[PDB]
Design a protein around this ligand. Structure first.
Ligand SMILES: [Mg+2]
Lengths: 66, 445, 608
């Protein structure tokens, strides 16, 4: 008896752990986890964590070339 | 698919409107140029003996080597309401459209043409220095407007409305600016006559009465016209769209005479080389092409350095690549531009090594990329690193009883386009929120 | 801008960059030259007439930014201008030649850059009158400009001889540069060392040109020469000594390499070890001949804080003897604290610094302006590769997918310990297991480089194969290398930060790396130089392999790309290996068991 609305994104183990890091530096946003290719996130904060993913790979590479 | 899009629009046009279009010799000549050589052969064979032929005679004449293209030609011929296949006396009596037939006959004989070739004034002027230069000026203005650099001579208001309403160069008024869509970049990648066909397709798609057959016939004799002569100013709607396409830079009109430029012939048919770009593992550009338009279109996805008379140089940056990817430009679009701007030396070496390796094996234990990948795959791996994800937001169910909801409400749902994700053995499949129309009733029943 | 030049609508991003205002001459076809008015970056066409003739002067007056297949990139610099005017090439002749070969009218900014690149050449000259720096001038005219500067302290005077190093920089800003061009034949006081060579040795033409660099006048011009690895740089130095023919010594901060160049020296030269000597951490015994050699190491001058009196007597002896020429090998480490003191201590009438790579972690390479002088000669990597003078190498990068558990532990790990944590992924073990299977199936000699000596030992012990790191007993080390080289049955070695250098192994043909410093471009290139001297380089079907196992989803991506960009600058791009064929076809994968992965993570956690 469980069928609840959520934003399911096909993902990777690495970006899954990044989503858990999002939870770590600001908690109780992302809701539950199915596997490495299926996580469930707050549908209000999907774009919040999208832009945080953007700054995540920005911190990952940062590609200066100046 | 350009002639295919034209034929598709003609088949969308209903039968009697089509037959009204088949009335005049210039329109019939244009459609004759559209049809494949087999259908052209069929209609020229029929046009001089007025005998309805059974289909079995055509089957006897046709060698089976070209049978597929034969079927394509006759299927277009039938669907364009141009053929009359009726199985009178049991066998399929075949008939060409008679209005089309007599108009082609009059065009070939030079009989009644009713100035569908053009209502002539024949007060010709020079076209190289007036018509071609005015066309080049106006088309340069609209091309740099479609580049995005500021320019004083903006396009007309109706074509501005065309860009606004159409998904082509979306004039995002919230940002207040025209913006390159992915469809806009496809439009940029298109051939010149392809771009012309796109423009007229959107304009005819949005224009309504402005009679439809007036648009069709007027455009077809516009394609049928020649260059550098004066002509009589025809219908009222044809005249007002004539002044409209005068504002497009297509015709040099002296407010009844008008002088159609080279673009009418361009619409009728097309026309270390120019545009042959040396690729580099150094990611430096040695183009064999220089124009202000060339710099304008290459600045969108390349850091450039300087312009010479044929070789404008610069450097591809990953910032420029990601800039293109964030502009809505497809990586497929970028690499397609790269095969349009390939260079002969690398092409010769790639062909020699292609024959050399096909002498060994087809597999070669490597992925397939015929052009030198050191310029390409370095971008393409980064282009593989562009999207590399997929997001579903909306309704989602799980833990089904069995596979009863995957071979008939997911295979037939695949045939109608209502679900978003298909995973039978997970017992979970995602659907779009708008595409919940016919997913959740046979699930209930 | 000598033009009206209404700008392009997209010439705004040509921010002082649209150089089409300056016209195109009709001689644009034959001539190859385009000129940047502001940056001075210089365009060379490879498929243009007389480009081969003009490229010599392009190197002489400009620096080469890049030389790819089609269009070479150069840049005028005051360093290369100083080198050209030191060779002797006057401004109007140079301007006439470049405009005669220039597709366009020449920018007066660059022209006056050349005009301002006019020095007082031949006007300041330091002479070492038996360990006494007498800073002569050719005229009293120089003295009036020189006396305006007051940092100091025909006409010479007292200078602190250590302060000569800094006042060379000072005279570089006040633009009266001294020159070092030894009149050894006119210096009859120093004893000559007349030593020749055998006719069986063959000098390659680039080595001949390098010998012509400091011998434009015959006086020994002092400077810099950097050449690719395995180019017979030892033989070039031996030839330079055999044509200088005076008292001379050789320096390099190692021991095994130094004794092997002693071997190589006394091998090809006609000089007997009677004239030769050696001074290092082990043995401190000199020759007593009037002329000869002390081949030696920086070790014996960089440390004087704690030395034996044997070391003290030897350094006293070598300081007392005034030498004519010195050789500075692997010069990329000398500008540090105790290391460039050797330049202050040693007074020789000619200098030359040598290294495989003239790159380091900082711009102390610019100190050679006031340390060892200008650059005399360089060779081209692609030129020697396609000529078969150096190897033709396939370069590959192998991205190891970072596993989930090591990834989350990596994210919760501290910064400087994250490196070992991403290195300990078992997917790297599986991939290198299949790769060593495939290349020993191919029968290749495979070499692994790791910065962590412990991790190198971990990989070697997991493979059940020998280990080579920084602090092992020497007899164990010679046992392993003897087995590998002489024994055909031993073929795969795991090297480290002492095995990348100080040994001579041209036998290397397949190289892998897993760890290095943050920005060790130079150390990375020293690692790659081991396979650069792969002598199987003339036959067709040869393609040497370089690999690099990098854990994905890391800033190791950034580190590896930043270090490997120097080799790309040399002309060595790295092919993609992300998904490979045969990952599953090998039956055993090292820690393919998830519980084995957990136990390995447990081990690295217990150490952490
Ligand atoms: Mg080597």
């Amino acid at each position: 008896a469980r069928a609840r609305k959520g934003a399911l994104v096909q993902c990777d183990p690495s970006i899954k752990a990044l989503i858990l890091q999002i939870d770590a530096k600001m908690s109780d946003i992302v809701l539950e986890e199915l596997d490495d290719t299926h996580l469930l996130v707050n549908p209000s904060k999907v774009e919040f964590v999208k832009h945080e993913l953007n700054r995540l790979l920005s911190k990952n590479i940062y590609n200066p070339m100046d | 698919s350009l002639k295919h899009s034209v034929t598709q629009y003609l088949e969308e046009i209903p039968q009697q409107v089509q037959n009204r279009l088949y009335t005049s010799p210039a329109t019939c000549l244009a459609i004759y140029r559209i049809l494949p050589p087999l259908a052209k052969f069929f209609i020229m064979a029929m046009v001089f003996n007025e005998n309805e032929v059974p289909l079995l005679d055509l089957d006897k004449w046709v060698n089976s080597n070209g049978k597929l293209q034969f079927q394509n030609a006759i299927k277009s011929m039938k669907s364009l309401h141009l053929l009359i296949p009726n199985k009178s006396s049991g066998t399929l009596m075949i008939n060409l459209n008679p209005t089309f037939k007599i108009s082609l006959r009059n065009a070939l004989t030079g009989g009644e043409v009713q100035n569908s070739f053009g209502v002539v004034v024949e007060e010709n002027v020079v076209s190289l220095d007036l018509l071609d230069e005015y066309s080049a000026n106006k088309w340069e203005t609209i091309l740099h407007f479609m580049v995005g650099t500021p320019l004083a001579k903006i396009p007309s208001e109706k074509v501005l409305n065309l860009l606004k309403h159409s998904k082509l160069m979306e004039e995002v008024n919230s940002t207040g600016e025209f913006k390159i869509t992915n469809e806009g970049f496809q439009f940029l990648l298109q051939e010149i006559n392809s771009q012309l066909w796109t423009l007229l397709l959107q304009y005819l798609k949005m224009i309504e009465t402005m009679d439809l057959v007036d648009v069709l016939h007027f455009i077809f004799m516009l394609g049928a016209l020649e260059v550098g002569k004066a002509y009589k100013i025809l219908s009222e709607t044809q005249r007002i769209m004539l002044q409209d396409m005068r504002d497009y830079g297509l015709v040099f009109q002296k407010h009844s005479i008008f002088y159609p430029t080279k673009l009418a012939l361009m619409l009728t048919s097309d026309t270390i080389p120019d545009g042959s770009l040396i690729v580099e593992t150094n990611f430096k550009i040695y183009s064999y092409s220089n124009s202000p338009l060339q710099i304008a279109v290459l600045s969108l996805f390349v850091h450039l350095k300087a312009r010479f008379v044929n070789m404008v140089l610069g450097q591809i940056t990953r910032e420029s690549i990601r800039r293109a990817l964030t502009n809505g430009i497809t990586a497929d679009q970028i690499i397609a531009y790269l095969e349009t701007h390939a260079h002969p030396q690398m092409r010769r070496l790639a062909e020699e090594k292609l024959e050399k390796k096909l002498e060994l094996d087809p597999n070669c234990k490597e992925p397939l990329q015929v052009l030198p990948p050191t310029v390409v795959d370095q971008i393409r791996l980064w282009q593989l690193e562009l999207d590399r994800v997929i997001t579903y937001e909306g309704s989602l169910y799980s833990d089904f009883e069995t596979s009863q909801e995957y071979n008939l409400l997911s295979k037939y749902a695949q045939d109608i386009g209502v679900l978003l994700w298909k995973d039978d053995k997970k017992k979970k499949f995602f659907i779009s929120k708008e595409g919940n129309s016919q997913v959740l009733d046979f699930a209930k029943r | 801008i000598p033009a009206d030049f209404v700008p392009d609508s997209v010439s705004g991003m040509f921010r002082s960059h649209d150089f089409s205002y300056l016209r195109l001459r009709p001689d644009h076809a034959s001539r190859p030259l385009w000129i940047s008015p502001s940056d001075g970056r210089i365009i060379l066409e490879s498929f243009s007439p007389l480009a081969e003739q003009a490229q010599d002067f392009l190197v002489t007056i400009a620096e080469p930014i890049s030389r790819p297949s089609h269009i070479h990139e150069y840049k005028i610099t005051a360093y290369s201008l100083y080198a050209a005017v030191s060779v002797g090439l006057e401004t109007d002749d140079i301007i006439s030649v470049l405009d005669r070969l220039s597709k366009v009218p020449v920018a007066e900014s660059i022209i006056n850059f050349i005009k301002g690149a006019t020095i007082s050449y031949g006007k300041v000259k330091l002479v070492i009158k038996h360990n006494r720096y007498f800073v002569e001038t050719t005229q009293a005219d120089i003295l009036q400009m020189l006396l305006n500067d007051s940092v100091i302290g025909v006409h010479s005077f007292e200078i602190a001889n250590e302060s000569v190093e800094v006042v060379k920089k000072r005279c570089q800003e006040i633009d009266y540069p001294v020159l070092e061009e030894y009149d050894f034949r006119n210096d009859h006081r120093n004893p000559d060392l007349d030593i020749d060579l055998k006719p069986s040795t063959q000098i390659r033409p680039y080595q001949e040109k390098s010998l012509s660099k400091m011998f434009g006048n015959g006086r020994a011009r002092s400077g810099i020469i950097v050449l690719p690895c395995g180019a017979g740089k030892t033989l070039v130095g031996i030839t330079a000594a055999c044509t200088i023919k005076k008292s001379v010594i050789v320096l390099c901060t190692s021991s095994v390499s130094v004794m092997q160049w002693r071997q190589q020296f006394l091998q090809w030269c006609t000089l007997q070890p009677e004239n030769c000597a050696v001074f290092t951490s082990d043995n401190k015994e000199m020759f007593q001949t009037e002329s000869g050699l002390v081949v030696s190491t920086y070790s014996m001058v960089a440390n004087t804080r704690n030395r034996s009196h044997d070391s003290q007597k030897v350094m006293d002896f070598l300081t007392g003897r005034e030498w004519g020429f010195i050789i500075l090998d692997e010069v990329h480490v000398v500008p540090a604290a105790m290391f460039r003191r050797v330049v202050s201590t040693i007074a020789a009438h000619a200098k030359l610094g040598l290294t495989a790579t003239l790159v380091r972690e900082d711009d102390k390479i610019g100190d050679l302006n006031f340390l060892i002088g200008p650059k005399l000669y360089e060779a081209n990597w692609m030129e020697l590769s396609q000529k078969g003078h150096i190897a033709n190498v396939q370069c590959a990068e192998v991205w190891c997918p970072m596993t989930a558990e090591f990834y989350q532990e990596y994210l919760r790990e501290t910064a400087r310990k994250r490196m070992l944590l991403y290195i300990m992924n078992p997917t790297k073990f599986q991939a290198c297991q299949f790769l060593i299977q495939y290349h020993e199936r191919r029968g290749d000699k495979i070499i692994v480089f790791s910065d962590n000596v412990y991790a190198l030992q971990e990989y070697a012990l997991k493979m059940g194969k020998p280990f080579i790191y920084g602090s092992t007993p020497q007899q164990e080390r010679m046992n392993i290398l003897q087995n590998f080289q002489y024994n055909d049955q031993i073929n795969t070695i795991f090297l480290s930060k002492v095995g990348d250098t100080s040994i001579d192994l041209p036998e290397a043909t397949c190289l892998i790396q897993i760890s290095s410093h943050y920005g060790s471009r130079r150390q990375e290139a020293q690692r790659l130089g081991r396979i650069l001297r792969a002598k199987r380089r003339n036959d067709e079907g040869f393609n040497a392999f370089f690999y690099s196992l990098v854990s994905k989803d890391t800033q190791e991506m950034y580190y590896s790309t930043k270090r490997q960009a120097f080799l790309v600058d040399q002309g060595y791009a790295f092919k993609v290996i992300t998904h490979l064929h045969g990952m599953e076809n090998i039956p055993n994968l090292a820690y393919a068991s998830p519980r084995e992965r957990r136990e390995l993570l447990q081990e690295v956690l217990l150490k952490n």
